[PDB]
């Protein structure tokens, strides 16, 4: 019955199930959760672990003694449940000081503060066992053109990430960074707006091996992009360090619906890809139970995230293992796609008359791809209509 267990590596942010329900037009609908209670409840649902922003775990502005107590209690909850903390991140967005950014704020003093705030939490993340440190630059960007010279901002972004890499390395930490792209919201346009832009930027960092992406289903869908395709490019680049799973009702504000909601077939093809490719990182839900819900609905929504992943995993595996699908994949030449175009090399290609003067273009054009039959097999498998 699609029951999650820790081995499935499902994780949740404190801020997900803990979202009190404030939106741009509405006050909170639920009380705040104690992180200890969330750890407990998520463990009971079959989660593997939790994640946190600094300011989710330790109230902003806490004293050193308050901070120690928050962490002690959290550690006890982890120990009491067997939950892990595979990822952490910094809140560089909520507080008014970050209104023009953290790492790319126009004010230099804010940029320096953002780095110090991040570094302090990297140390805590390492103490709690995190393997990945996410950065979501939600305030990096602009509403107007003159406000932000993007080349200069990218210089500042690179400087910041390079400093963080220097810091990790200086401490002998094994933690790696993952940039979580988003195209807009809360800024009118956000820098590094997609998987692609983040992947490209990483290639210009001093130590690129320390950085990957943390793509989010809904964020790429806010640009109308194909999330599975972007994940495939991240995997191709060796950069899928972490992933955020949720749902999104098309090109709108970031909804953060439970995984499986929104574009269901994209969720199917995503799970197919992650499982086929042997992705071994967390299956992290960056979601928000809708503010219509009470706490029973919070936990139902969280459970549904995991359930939907597991249903989709079953159906994708059945699709790939079905003889009839394997035949259809050959009929559609997915086998040829995986073979080199020209392992014979350039000169041999240039000398091959079968590739040009004697290529029968009309006969090749007439060969149907058989993609609709393949896709209806995929649909039948998804729906359990085999």
mmCIF file of C-alpha atoms in Angstrom:
data_model
loop_
_atom_site.group_PDB
_atom_site.id
_atom_site.type_symbol
_atom_site.label_atom_id
_atom_site.label_comp_id
_atom_site.label_asym_id
_atom_site.label_seq_id
_atom_site.Cartn_x
_atom_site.Cartn_y
_atom_site.Cartn_z
ATOM 1 C CA UNK A 1 0.000 0.000 0.000
ATOM 2 C CA UNK A 2 2.746 2.475 -1.018
ATOM 3 C CA UNK A 3 4.040 2.876 2.511
ATOM 4 C CA UNK A 4 7.168 5.006 2.807
ATOM 5 C CA UNK A 5 10.091 3.937 4.867
ATOM 6 C CA UNK A 6 13.399 5.726 5.648
ATOM 7 C CA UNK A 7 15.225 3.838 2.920
ATOM 8 C CA UNK A 8 13.201 5.906 0.325
ATOM 9 C CA UNK A 9 15.113 8.966 1.572
ATOM 10 C CA UNK A 10 12.043 11.229 1.817
ATOM 11 C CA UNK A 11 12.810 14.489 3.549
ATOM 12 C CA UNK A 12 10.874 17.618 4.430
ATOM 13 C CA UNK A 13 11.804 21.148 5.398
ATOM 14 C CA UNK A 14 10.745 22.410 8.810
ATOM 15 C CA UNK A 15 9.142 25.317 6.920
ATOM 16 C CA UNK A 16 6.960 23.000 4.803
ATOM 17 C CA UNK A 17 4.685 21.228 7.268
ATOM 18 C CA UNK A 18 5.428 24.203 9.545
ATOM 19 C CA UNK A 19 4.028 26.775 7.118
ATOM 20 C CA UNK A 20 1.497 28.796 9.079
ATOM 21 C CA UNK A 21 -0.447 29.825 5.972
ATOM 22 C CA UNK A 22 0.416 33.553 5.461
ATOM 23 C CA UNK A 23 0.175 34.399 1.751
ATOM 24 C CA UNK A 24 0.255 37.785 -0.012
ATOM 25 C CA UNK A 25 -3.330 38.411 0.677
ATOM 26 C CA UNK A 26 -3.937 36.455 3.922
ATOM 27 C CA UNK A 27 -2.936 36.047 7.552
ATOM 28 C CA UNK A 28 -1.642 32.822 9.038
ATOM 29 C CA UNK A 29 -4.349 29.987 9.492
ATOM 30 C CA UNK A 30 -2.271 27.596 11.684
ATOM 31 C CA UNK A 31 -0.149 27.986 14.782
ATOM 32 C CA UNK A 32 3.588 27.583 14.627
ATOM 33 C CA UNK A 33 4.945 24.075 15.093
ATOM 34 C CA UNK A 34 7.788 23.243 17.446
ATOM 35 C CA UNK A 35 10.503 21.617 15.270
ATOM 36 C CA UNK A 36 10.519 18.705 17.744
ATOM 37 C CA UNK A 37 6.896 17.935 17.020
ATOM 38 C CA UNK A 38 7.498 18.084 13.264
ATOM 39 C CA UNK A 39 10.424 15.691 13.539
ATOM 40 C CA UNK A 40 8.244 13.303 15.538
ATOM 41 C CA UNK A 41 5.250 13.452 13.190
ATOM 42 C CA UNK A 42 7.324 13.161 10.018
ATOM 43 C CA UNK A 43 9.145 10.142 11.423
ATOM 44 C CA UNK A 44 5.788 8.491 12.147
ATOM 45 C CA UNK A 45 4.785 9.057 8.508
ATOM 46 C CA UNK A 46 7.926 7.227 7.287
ATOM 47 C CA UNK A 47 10.189 10.158 6.482
ATOM 48 C CA UNK A 48 13.966 9.748 6.435
ATOM 49 C CA UNK A 49 14.836 13.215 7.578
ATOM 50 C CA UNK A 50 14.274 16.959 7.802
ATOM 51 C CA UNK A 51 15.940 20.094 6.557
ATOM 52 C CA UNK A 52 16.037 23.648 7.897
ATOM 53 C CA UNK A 53 16.826 27.248 7.319
ATOM 54 C CA UNK A 54 18.862 28.736 10.159
ATOM 55 C CA UNK A 55 15.922 30.859 11.191
ATOM 56 C CA UNK A 56 13.474 27.927 11.207
ATOM 57 C CA UNK A 57 15.481 26.082 13.808
ATOM 58 C CA UNK A 58 16.757 29.016 15.877
ATOM 59 C CA UNK A 59 14.532 32.104 16.066
ATOM 60 C CA UNK A 60 16.282 35.077 14.482
ATOM 61 C CA UNK A 61 18.087 37.116 17.097
ATOM 62 C CA UNK A 62 18.414 34.324 19.667
ATOM 63 C CA UNK A 63 21.040 34.509 22.377
ATOM 64 C CA UNK A 64 23.822 31.942 22.488
ATOM 65 C CA UNK A 65 22.125 30.162 25.411
ATOM 66 C CA UNK A 66 18.762 30.105 23.550
ATOM 67 C CA UNK A 67 20.451 28.836 20.446
ATOM 68 C CA UNK A 68 22.108 26.010 22.369
ATOM 69 C CA UNK A 69 18.807 24.917 23.849
ATOM 70 C CA UNK A 70 16.985 24.958 20.492
ATOM 71 C CA UNK A 71 19.708 22.800 18.997
ATOM 72 C CA UNK A 72 19.818 20.434 22.008
ATOM 73 C CA UNK A 73 16.092 19.812 21.785
ATOM 74 C CA UNK A 74 16.300 19.263 18.030
ATOM 75 C CA UNK A 75 19.156 16.839 18.451
ATOM 76 C CA UNK A 76 17.202 14.907 21.024
ATOM 77 C CA UNK A 77 14.247 14.645 18.618
ATOM 78 C CA UNK A 78 16.578 13.335 15.878
ATOM 79 C CA UNK A 79 18.004 10.798 18.323
ATOM 80 C CA UNK A 80 14.538 9.802 19.557
ATOM 81 C CA UNK A 81 13.307 9.122 16.010
ATOM 82 C CA UNK A 82 16.316 8.120 13.921
ATOM 83 C CA UNK A 83 15.655 11.073 11.588
ATOM 84 C CA UNK A 84 18.538 12.572 9.668
ATOM 85 C CA UNK A 85 19.346 16.113 8.522
ATOM 86 C CA UNK A 86 20.713 15.749 4.984
ATOM 87 C CA UNK A 87 20.473 19.395 3.947
ATOM 88 C CA UNK A 88 20.314 22.854 5.424
ATOM 89 C CA UNK A 89 20.116 26.382 4.082
ATOM 90 C CA UNK A 90 20.143 30.057 5.089
ATOM 91 C CA UNK A 91 17.199 32.435 5.268
ATOM 92 C CA UNK A 92 18.488 35.320 3.122
ATOM 93 C CA UNK A 93 14.980 36.519 2.226
ATOM 94 C CA UNK A 94 12.516 37.113 4.979
ATOM 95 C CA UNK A 95 14.164 39.877 6.983
ATOM 96 C CA UNK A 96 13.750 43.424 5.601
ATOM 97 C CA UNK A 97 17.631 43.899 5.436
ATOM 98 C CA UNK A 98 17.568 41.439 2.507
ATOM 99 C CA UNK A 99 15.019 43.466 0.528
ATOM 100 C CA UNK A 100 17.473 43.933 -2.365
ATOM 101 C CA UNK A 101 19.289 40.611 -1.879
ATOM 102 C CA UNK A 102 21.809 38.883 0.293
ATOM 103 C CA UNK A 103 24.849 38.028 -1.808
ATOM 104 C CA UNK A 104 23.899 40.519 -4.543
ATOM 105 C CA UNK A 105 22.385 43.324 -2.458
ATOM 106 C CA UNK A 106 23.475 46.681 -3.783
ATOM 107 C CA UNK A 107 24.601 47.561 -0.253
ATOM 108 C CA UNK A 108 28.024 46.053 0.360
ATOM 109 C CA UNK A 109 27.514 45.808 4.117
ATOM 110 C CA UNK A 110 24.418 43.641 3.522
ATOM 111 C CA UNK A 111 26.407 41.342 1.217
ATOM 112 C CA UNK A 112 29.046 40.865 3.935
ATOM 113 C CA UNK A 113 26.354 40.173 6.550
ATOM 114 C CA UNK A 114 24.676 37.634 4.267
ATOM 115 C CA UNK A 115 27.974 35.752 3.973
ATOM 116 C CA UNK A 116 28.560 35.763 7.734
ATOM 117 C CA UNK A 117 25.006 34.558 8.398
ATOM 118 C CA UNK A 118 25.499 31.760 5.871
ATOM 119 C CA UNK A 119 28.870 30.691 7.274
ATOM 120 C CA UNK A 120 27.537 30.463 10.814
ATOM 121 C CA UNK A 121 24.808 28.094 9.622
ATOM 122 C CA UNK A 122 27.157 25.986 7.491
ATOM 123 C CA UNK A 123 28.982 25.159 10.719
ATOM 124 C CA UNK A 124 25.716 24.048 12.346
ATOM 125 C CA UNK A 125 24.625 22.106 9.273
ATOM 126 C CA UNK A 126 27.881 20.150 9.379
ATOM 127 C CA UNK A 127 27.399 19.446 13.100
ATOM 128 C CA UNK A 128 23.948 18.028 12.327
ATOM 129 C CA UNK A 129 25.294 15.821 9.526
ATOM 130 C CA UNK A 130 24.150 17.665 6.424
ATOM 131 C CA UNK A 131 25.764 16.661 3.151
ATOM 132 C CA UNK A 132 24.293 19.482 1.079
ATOM 133 C CA UNK A 133 23.968 23.202 1.762
ATOM 134 C CA UNK A 134 21.307 24.826 -0.409
ATOM 135 C CA UNK A 135 21.214 28.445 -1.563
ATOM 136 C CA UNK A 136 17.937 29.883 -2.844
ATOM 137 C CA UNK A 137 18.680 33.451 -3.885
ATOM 138 C CA UNK A 138 15.065 34.563 -3.755
ATOM 139 C CA UNK A 139 15.882 38.234 -3.208
ATOM 140 C CA UNK A 140 18.606 38.396 -5.889
ATOM 141 C CA UNK A 141 17.173 40.300 -8.827
ATOM 142 C CA UNK A 142 15.051 43.304 -9.601
ATOM 143 C CA UNK A 143 11.696 44.845 -10.410
ATOM 144 C CA UNK A 144 13.208 47.495 -12.726
ATOM 145 C CA UNK A 145 16.079 47.690 -15.156
ATOM 146 C CA UNK A 146 18.292 50.368 -13.653
ATOM 147 C CA UNK A 147 18.266 48.861 -10.152
ATOM 148 C CA UNK A 148 20.549 45.933 -10.865
ATOM 149 C CA UNK A 149 23.529 45.660 -13.229
ATOM 150 C CA UNK A 150 23.410 41.910 -13.778
ATOM 151 C CA UNK A 151 27.078 41.496 -14.767
ATOM 152 C CA UNK A 152 28.065 43.261 -11.534
ATOM 153 C CA UNK A 153 25.555 41.178 -9.566
ATOM 154 C CA UNK A 154 26.963 37.963 -11.072
ATOM 155 C CA UNK A 155 30.442 39.133 -10.078
ATOM 156 C CA UNK A 156 29.147 39.513 -6.520
ATOM 157 C CA UNK A 157 27.358 36.150 -6.668
ATOM 158 C CA UNK A 158 30.526 34.403 -7.849
ATOM 159 C CA UNK A 159 32.585 36.198 -5.199
ATOM 160 C CA UNK A 160 30.161 35.002 -2.501
ATOM 161 C CA UNK A 161 30.050 31.389 -3.638
ATOM 162 C CA UNK A 162 33.833 31.339 -4.053
ATOM 163 C CA UNK A 163 34.257 32.594 -0.482
ATOM 164 C CA UNK A 164 31.918 29.893 0.761
ATOM 165 C CA UNK A 165 33.941 27.266 -1.090
ATOM 166 C CA UNK A 166 37.143 28.637 0.373
ATOM 167 C CA UNK A 167 35.514 28.467 3.806
ATOM 168 C CA UNK A 168 34.414 24.768 3.395
ATOM 169 C CA UNK A 169 37.716 23.796 2.193
ATOM 170 C CA UNK A 170 39.561 25.642 5.009
ATOM 171 C CA UNK A 171 37.538 23.698 7.574
ATOM 172 C CA UNK A 172 37.978 20.338 5.887
ATOM 173 C CA UNK A 173 34.231 19.949 5.498
ATOM 174 C CA UNK A 174 32.749 17.453 3.013
ATOM 175 C CA UNK A 175 29.531 19.438 2.538
ATOM 176 C CA UNK A 176 28.693 20.626 -0.987
ATOM 177 C CA UNK A 177 26.528 23.462 -2.205
ATOM 178 C CA UNK A 178 23.385 23.318 -4.312
ATOM 179 C CA UNK A 179 21.816 26.359 -5.961
ATOM 180 C CA UNK A 180 17.979 26.258 -6.020
ATOM 181 C CA UNK A 181 16.861 28.193 -9.132
ATOM 182 C CA UNK A 182 13.621 30.137 -9.353
ATOM 183 C CA UNK A 183 12.642 32.507 -12.176
ATOM 184 C CA UNK A 184 10.660 35.120 -10.251
ATOM 185 C CA UNK A 185 8.871 35.704 -6.937
ATOM 186 C CA UNK A 186 9.506 37.522 -4.655
ATOM 187 C CA UNK A 187 11.616 39.621 -7.043
ATOM 188 C CA UNK A 188 10.147 40.604 -10.386
ATOM 189 C CA UNK A 189 12.942 38.619 -12.023
ATOM 190 C CA UNK A 190 15.393 36.479 -10.030
ATOM 191 C CA UNK A 191 19.020 35.986 -11.057
ATOM 192 C CA UNK A 192 19.976 32.452 -12.147
ATOM 193 C CA UNK A 193 16.308 31.890 -13.037
ATOM 194 C CA UNK A 194 16.455 28.263 -14.225
ATOM 195 C CA UNK A 195 18.458 25.009 -13.938
ATOM 196 C CA UNK A 196 20.309 25.998 -17.023
ATOM 197 C CA UNK A 197 21.390 29.403 -15.805
ATOM 198 C CA UNK A 198 22.549 27.953 -12.489
ATOM 199 C CA UNK A 199 24.481 25.143 -14.197
ATOM 200 C CA UNK A 200 26.174 27.709 -16.435
ATOM 201 C CA UNK A 201 27.131 29.954 -13.532
ATOM 202 C CA UNK A 202 28.662 27.089 -11.578
ATOM 203 C CA UNK A 203 31.128 26.503 -14.417
ATOM 204 C CA UNK A 204 32.652 29.898 -13.705
ATOM 205 C CA UNK A 205 33.183 29.302 -9.956
ATOM 206 C CA UNK A 206 36.744 28.711 -8.770
ATOM 207 C CA UNK A 207 36.021 25.197 -7.482
ATOM 208 C CA UNK A 208 33.076 24.028 -9.584
ATOM 209 C CA UNK A 209 33.140 20.532 -8.139
ATOM 210 C CA UNK A 210 31.796 21.944 -4.851
ATOM 211 C CA UNK A 211 28.558 23.184 -6.430
ATOM 212 C CA UNK A 212 25.507 21.632 -7.989
ATOM 213 C CA UNK A 213 21.826 22.383 -8.368
ATOM 214 C CA UNK A 214 18.746 21.829 -6.189
ATOM 215 C CA UNK A 215 16.041 22.129 -8.858
ATOM 216 C CA UNK A 216 12.409 22.473 -7.783
ATOM 217 C CA UNK A 217 9.503 21.052 -9.799
ATOM 218 C CA UNK A 218 7.364 24.140 -9.485
ATOM 219 C CA UNK A 219 10.117 26.648 -10.164
ATOM 220 C CA UNK A 220 11.009 25.333 -13.603
ATOM 221 C CA UNK A 221 7.266 25.094 -14.319
ATOM 222 C CA UNK A 222 6.943 28.820 -13.457
ATOM 223 C CA UNK A 223 8.968 29.364 -16.652
ATOM 224 C CA UNK A 224 6.813 26.841 -18.520
ATOM 225 C CA UNK A 225 9.800 24.489 -18.791
ATOM 226 C CA UNK A 226 9.874 20.669 -18.799
ATOM 227 C CA UNK A 227 11.109 19.702 -15.374
ATOM 228 C CA UNK A 228 12.181 16.153 -16.314
ATOM 229 C CA UNK A 229 14.196 17.549 -19.210
ATOM 230 C CA UNK A 230 15.976 19.992 -16.911
ATOM 231 C CA UNK A 231 16.701 17.226 -14.427
ATOM 232 C CA UNK A 232 18.143 15.167 -17.250
ATOM 233 C CA UNK A 233 20.478 18.042 -18.158
ATOM 234 C CA UNK A 234 21.520 18.375 -14.504
ATOM 235 C CA UNK A 235 22.218 14.629 -14.340
ATOM 236 C CA UNK A 236 24.116 14.842 -17.638
ATOM 237 C CA UNK A 237 26.283 17.586 -16.119
ATOM 238 C CA UNK A 238 26.903 15.578 -12.939
ATOM 239 C CA UNK A 239 25.209 18.278 -10.861
ATOM 240 C CA UNK A 240 21.986 16.847 -9.383
ATOM 241 C CA UNK A 241 23.122 17.143 -5.763
ATOM 242 C CA UNK A 242 19.611 17.451 -4.315
ATOM 243 C CA UNK A 243 16.053 17.941 -5.589
ATOM 244 C CA UNK A 244 12.893 19.654 -4.401
ATOM 245 C CA UNK A 245 9.649 17.836 -5.141
ATOM 246 C CA UNK A 246 6.220 19.497 -5.191
ATOM 247 C CA UNK A 247 3.397 20.438 -7.509
ATOM 248 C CA UNK A 248 2.541 23.571 -9.404
ATOM 249 C CA UNK A 249 -0.557 24.641 -11.304
ATOM 250 C CA UNK A 250 1.286 26.058 -14.323
ATOM 251 C CA UNK A 251 2.673 29.546 -14.809
ATOM 252 C CA UNK A 252 1.626 31.416 -11.653
ATOM 253 C CA UNK A 253 2.863 32.327 -8.210
ATOM 254 C CA UNK A 254 4.846 29.578 -6.522
ATOM 255 C CA UNK A 255 2.242 27.276 -5.062
ATOM 256 C CA UNK A 256 4.297 24.542 -3.512
ATOM 257 C CA UNK A 257 1.474 21.991 -3.781
ATOM 258 C CA UNK A 258 2.119 18.469 -2.560
ATOM 259 C CA UNK A 259 4.099 16.263 -4.911
ATOM 260 C CA UNK A 260 1.864 14.615 -7.495
ATOM 261 C CA UNK A 261 -0.487 17.583 -7.614
ATOM 262 C CA UNK A 262 -0.136 19.997 -10.518
ATOM 263 C CA UNK A 263 1.359 18.346 -13.586
ATOM 264 C CA UNK A 264 0.879 14.655 -12.806
ATOM 265 C CA UNK A 265 2.502 13.300 -15.959
ATOM 266 C CA UNK A 266 5.565 15.464 -15.372
ATOM 267 C CA UNK A 267 5.728 13.887 -11.908
ATOM 268 C CA UNK A 268 5.573 10.424 -13.517
ATOM 269 C CA UNK A 269 8.369 11.158 -15.980
ATOM 270 C CA UNK A 270 10.434 12.743 -13.212
ATOM 271 C CA UNK A 271 10.207 9.673 -10.981
ATOM 272 C CA UNK A 272 10.948 7.438 -13.967
ATOM 273 C CA UNK A 273 14.122 9.443 -14.599
ATOM 274 C CA UNK A 274 15.344 9.673 -11.010
ATOM 275 C CA UNK A 275 14.849 5.955 -10.462
ATOM 276 C CA UNK A 276 16.241 4.874 -13.870
ATOM 277 C CA UNK A 277 19.299 7.093 -13.377
ATOM 278 C CA UNK A 278 19.996 5.790 -9.865
ATOM 279 C CA UNK A 279 19.766 9.211 -8.194
ATOM 280 C CA UNK A 280 20.755 8.557 -4.590
ATOM 281 C CA UNK A 281 20.153 11.938 -2.979
ATOM 282 C CA UNK A 282 17.233 12.988 -0.797
ATOM 283 C CA UNK A 283 13.725 13.096 -2.201
ATOM 284 C CA UNK A 284 12.978 16.393 -0.508
ATOM 285 C CA UNK A 285 9.508 17.932 -0.439
ATOM 286 C CA UNK A 286 9.597 21.726 -0.566
ATOM 287 C CA UNK A 287 5.828 22.053 -0.306
ATOM 288 C CA UNK A 288 3.157 23.835 1.681
ATOM 289 C CA UNK A 289 -0.053 22.244 2.875
ATOM 290 C CA UNK A 290 -2.703 24.692 1.635
ATOM 291 C CA UNK A 291 -3.833 27.217 4.224
ATOM 292 C CA UNK A 292 -7.344 25.752 4.012
ATOM 293 C CA UNK A 293 -6.070 22.828 6.070
ATOM 294 C CA UNK A 294 -5.855 22.119 9.772
ATOM 295 C CA UNK A 295 -3.031 19.948 11.192
ATOM 296 C CA UNK A 296 -4.710 16.693 10.160
ATOM 297 C CA UNK A 297 -4.631 18.101 6.679
ATOM 298 C CA UNK A 298 -0.959 19.098 7.049
ATOM 299 C CA UNK A 299 0.017 15.523 7.832
ATOM 300 C CA UNK A 300 -2.301 14.102 5.170
ATOM 301 C CA UNK A 301 -0.692 16.382 2.578
ATOM 302 C CA UNK A 302 2.812 15.365 3.695
ATOM 303 C CA UNK A 303 1.852 11.679 3.552
ATOM 304 C CA UNK A 304 0.441 12.238 0.077
ATOM 305 C CA UNK A 305 3.771 13.597 -1.154
ATOM 306 C CA UNK A 306 5.429 10.268 -0.360
ATOM 307 C CA UNK A 307 2.512 8.108 -1.467
ATOM 308 C CA UNK A 308 2.413 9.737 -4.886
ATOM 309 C CA UNK A 309 6.156 9.286 -5.369
ATOM 310 C CA UNK A 310 5.817 5.596 -4.543
ATOM 311 C CA UNK A 311 2.822 5.021 -6.838
ATOM 312 C CA UNK A 312 4.641 6.738 -9.677
ATOM 313 C CA UNK A 313 7.802 4.721 -8.960
ATOM 314 C CA UNK A 314 5.806 1.484 -9.257
ATOM 315 C CA UNK A 315 4.159 2.519 -12.524
ATOM 316 C CA UNK A 316 7.359 3.814 -14.127
ATOM 317 C CA UNK A 317 9.208 0.619 -13.208
ATOM 318 C CA UNK A 318 6.388 -1.471 -14.661
ATOM 319 C CA UNK A 319 6.463 0.594 -17.853
ATOM 320 C CA UNK A 320 10.216 0.104 -18.304
ATOM 321 C CA UNK A 321 10.091 -3.616 -17.494
ATOM 322 C CA UNK A 322 7.152 -4.420 -19.801
ATOM 323 C CA UNK A 323 8.264 -6.458 -22.878
ATOM 324 C CA UNK A 324 5.739 -4.695 -24.937
ATOM 325 C CA UNK A 325 7.127 -1.301 -23.942
ATOM 326 C CA UNK A 326 10.665 -2.553 -24.594
ATOM 327 C CA UNK A 327 9.537 -3.531 -28.113
ATOM 328 C CA UNK A 328 7.878 -0.113 -28.572
ATOM 329 C CA UNK A 329 11.060 1.655 -27.456
ATOM 330 C CA UNK A 330 12.986 -0.232 -30.149
ATOM 331 C CA UNK A 331 10.258 0.569 -32.678
ATOM 332 C CA UNK A 332 10.739 4.262 -31.813
ATOM 333 C CA UNK A 333 14.547 3.944 -32.115
ATOM 334 C CA UNK A 334 15.355 4.844 -28.507
ATOM 335 C CA UNK A 335 18.122 2.247 -28.880
ATOM 336 C CA UNK A 336 19.627 4.199 -31.849
ATOM 337 C CA UNK A 337 19.437 7.427 -29.891
ATOM 338 C CA UNK A 338 21.850 5.937 -27.335
ATOM 339 C CA UNK A 339 24.414 4.864 -29.964
ATOM 340 C CA UNK A 340 27.089 7.238 -31.299
ATOM 341 C CA UNK A 341 26.290 9.144 -34.435
ATOM 342 C CA UNK A 342 29.796 8.734 -35.755
ATOM 343 C CA UNK A 343 32.102 6.504 -33.725
ATOM 344 C CA UNK A 344 33.810 5.973 -37.110
ATOM 345 C CA UNK A 345 35.074 9.568 -36.772
ATOM 346 C CA UNK A 346 34.869 12.785 -38.762
ATOM 347 C CA UNK A 347 36.800 11.691 -41.854
ATOM 348 C CA UNK A 348 34.849 8.476 -42.169
ATOM 349 C CA UNK A 349 31.593 10.478 -41.897
ATOM 350 C CA UNK A 350 32.812 12.917 -44.581
ATOM 351 C CA UNK A 351 33.699 9.969 -46.850
ATOM 352 C CA UNK A 352 30.431 8.071 -46.256
ATOM 353 C CA UNK A 353 28.180 8.533 -49.236
ATOM 354 C CA UNK A 354 25.307 6.805 -47.262
ATOM 355 C CA UNK A 355 25.272 9.910 -45.098
ATOM 356 C CA UNK A 356 24.684 12.371 -47.838
ATOM 357 C CA UNK A 357 24.777 11.831 -51.544
ATOM 358 C CA UNK A 358 23.257 8.449 -51.424
ATOM 359 C CA UNK A 359 21.015 9.013 -48.399
ATOM 360 C CA UNK A 360 17.441 8.377 -49.272
ATOM 361 C CA UNK A 361 15.875 11.245 -47.398
ATOM 362 C CA UNK A 362 12.353 10.418 -48.492
ATOM 363 C CA UNK A 363 12.514 6.862 -47.278
ATOM 364 C CA UNK A 364 13.907 7.996 -43.925
ATOM 365 C CA UNK A 365 11.232 10.715 -43.692
ATOM 366 C CA UNK A 366 8.492 8.159 -44.303
ATOM 367 C CA UNK A 367 9.483 6.085 -41.261
ATOM 368 C CA UNK A 368 6.998 6.873 -38.518
ATOM 369 C CA UNK A 369 8.424 7.386 -35.051
ATOM 370 C CA UNK A 370 5.675 5.347 -33.316
ATOM 371 C CA UNK A 371 5.741 7.822 -30.436
ATOM 372 C CA UNK A 372 1.956 7.911 -29.896
ATOM 373 C CA UNK A 373 1.702 4.158 -29.321
ATOM 374 C CA UNK A 374 4.667 4.385 -26.934
ATOM 375 C CA UNK A 375 3.049 7.256 -25.061
ATOM 376 C CA UNK A 376 -0.292 5.478 -24.786
ATOM 377 C CA UNK A 377 1.521 2.492 -23.280
ATOM 378 C CA UNK A 378 3.010 4.991 -20.809
ATOM 379 C CA UNK A 379 -0.389 6.419 -20.078
ATOM 380 C CA UNK A 380 -1.920 2.959 -19.606
ATOM 381 C CA UNK A 381 0.874 2.053 -17.186
ATOM 382 C CA UNK A 382 0.466 5.302 -15.201
ATOM 383 C CA UNK A 383 -3.289 4.777 -14.891
ATOM 384 C CA UNK A 384 -3.133 1.048 -14.208
ATOM 385 C CA UNK A 385 -5.129 0.416 -17.380
ATOM 386 C CA UNK A 386 -2.927 -2.541 -18.743
#
